[PDB]
Amino acid sequence: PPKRKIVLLMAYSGKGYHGMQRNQFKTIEDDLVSALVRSGCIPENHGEDMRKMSFQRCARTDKGVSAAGQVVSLKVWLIDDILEKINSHLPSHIRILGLKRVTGGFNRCDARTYCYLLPTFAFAHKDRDVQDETYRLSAETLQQVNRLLACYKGTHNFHNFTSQKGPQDPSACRYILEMYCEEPFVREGLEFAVIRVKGQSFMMHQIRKMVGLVVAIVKGYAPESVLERSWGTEKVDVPKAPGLGLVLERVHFEPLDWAQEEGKVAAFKEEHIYPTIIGTERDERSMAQWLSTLPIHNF
Numbered sequence: 696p697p698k699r700k701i702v703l704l705m706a707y708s709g710k711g712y713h714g715m716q717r718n719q720f721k722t723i724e725d726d727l728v729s730a731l732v733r734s735g736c737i738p739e740n741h742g743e744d745m746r747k748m749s750f751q752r753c754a755r756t757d758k759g760v761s762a763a764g765q766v767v768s769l770k771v772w773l774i775d776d777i778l779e780k781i782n783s784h785l786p787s788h789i790r791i792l793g794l795k796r797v798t799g800g801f802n803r804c805d806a807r808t809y810c811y812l813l814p815t816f817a818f819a820h821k822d823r824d825v826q827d828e829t830y831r832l833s834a835e836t837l838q839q840v841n842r843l844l845a846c847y848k849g850t851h852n853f854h855n856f857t858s859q860k861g862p863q864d865p866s867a868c869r870y871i872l873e874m875y876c877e878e879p880f881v882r883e884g885l886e887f888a889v890i891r892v893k894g895q896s897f898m899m900h901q902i903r904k905m906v907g908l909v910v911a912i913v914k915g916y917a918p919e920s921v922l923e924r925s926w927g928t929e930k931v932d933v934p935k936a937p938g939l940g941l942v943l944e945r946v947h948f949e950p951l952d953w954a955q956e957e958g959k960v961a962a963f964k965e966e967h968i969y970p971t972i973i974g975t976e977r978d979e980r981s982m983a984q985w986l987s988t989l990p991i992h993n994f
């Protein structure tokens with residue numbers, strides 16, 4: 696068949712993988728590459744050396760992180776029923792949701808939306824509220840969450856909201872368009888809520904730390920003043936919420952728009968992404984265990 700550049704819109708539940716791209720567990724790309732080879736889209740040696748098919752990914756999602764709207768591009772043999780055939784070789788929790796052929800000169804993924812799905816007891820005041828799963832989020836606690844998240848909006852020095860081996864880079868200005876928390880919902884006694892953040896050029900661990908600091912403040916481990924203070928020059932030990940709850944929702948970019956795929960994106964998030972996170976919180980208590988680490992931070 697004819698060789699063409701294509702762009703795929705893909706989604707995955709991230710549990711059980713070591714991330715999108717190989718740097719332990721297989722990666723999302725291992726599953727996609729195997730499906731590409733099995734279906735004959737690409738020859739075996741392009742699976743062995745992915746550079747040979749000009750494979751590119753928009754977002755290098757970390758261990759355990761999910762995605763409703765990852766985007767990749769590569770060159771394939773454009774076989775009949777290509778989309779169905781690739782999906783037929785993937786587990787149910789990884790899906791190609793859209794597939795378009797583009798010009799060989801289709802090279803843009805820094806502008807992004809993520810959500811973070813977490814048990815609401817992440818917001819329970821350590822002293823004043825019950826800490827178990829009967830906790831219910833008050834209108835007032837949610838106000839507070841939203842007020843603090845709103846503080847992130849705009850442009851700030853986020854040097855305390857990343858990590859690294861070397862010393863801390865004293866300047867890491869970044870832009871946040873929006874950040875808020877939705878009203879909670881309950882599944883079998885367990886209450887959750889979805890935080891959404893839209894921004895640009897997110898750094899490693901930045902969203903997890905942004906969520907982690909607001910959890911620490913709201914639960915009562917740190918004063919609200921730490922948020923403004925963390926913009927300052929001084930190092931602050933910012934708590935890093937787990938990767939489990941994080942979902943890459945959208946990459947915002949020859950132009951490219953996935954509007955007709957929004958229904959499938961939504962459905963896959965509801966059917967595959969959210970249930971795995973909720974299931975893991977219910978059965979493995981990831982959040983509850985992480986919250987118990989908060990006292991080690993010196994505020």
Ligand SMILES: [Cl-]
Nearest residue numbers: 755756757760
């Ligand atoms: Cl990530």
